[PDB]
Amino acid sequence: IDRLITGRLQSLQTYVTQQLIRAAEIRASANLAATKMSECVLGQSKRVD
Amino acid sequence: DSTECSNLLLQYGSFCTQLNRALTGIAVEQDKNTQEVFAQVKQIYKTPPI
Structure with missing residues (x-):
């Protein structure tokens, strides 16, 4: 599960940085x-x- | 150019595609910057000989 948490959390920080x-x-x-x-x-x- | 690494990199999904797409947008914009600065003129005006 910690891989899915890491991947989804890195994916979400990628989206928010792109939107900023x-x-x-x-x-x-x-x-x-x-x-x-x-x-x-x-x-x-x-x-x- | 390893095969075995690429079959792992696929499991990270859309990250590699959106990096290539981001740098492509940066690269295309550099031509637009050059056009907006220099290409403000419709015709190539030329100075008289005298």
Whole structure:
């Protein structure tokens, strides 16, 4: 049983670590979308492209 | 390239597949980074002779 506990516990730490890295990528995109909405919708940006 | 080891490594299931898939995503992204920086121009503009 201690092999199954070890494998499933290592599998679950693998999933949570992958989701932590994937969440940081999505947060970096949500900060860009909040910036785009503030400058482009609520204003008129002169920042090229 | 041992046979006997590979038949044990199979019993750990999807670990090896998702490592190859992770490094593949890292490798593909390096071309995207290079495209976004340099390929901002539609046509190859060329300087006059004078």
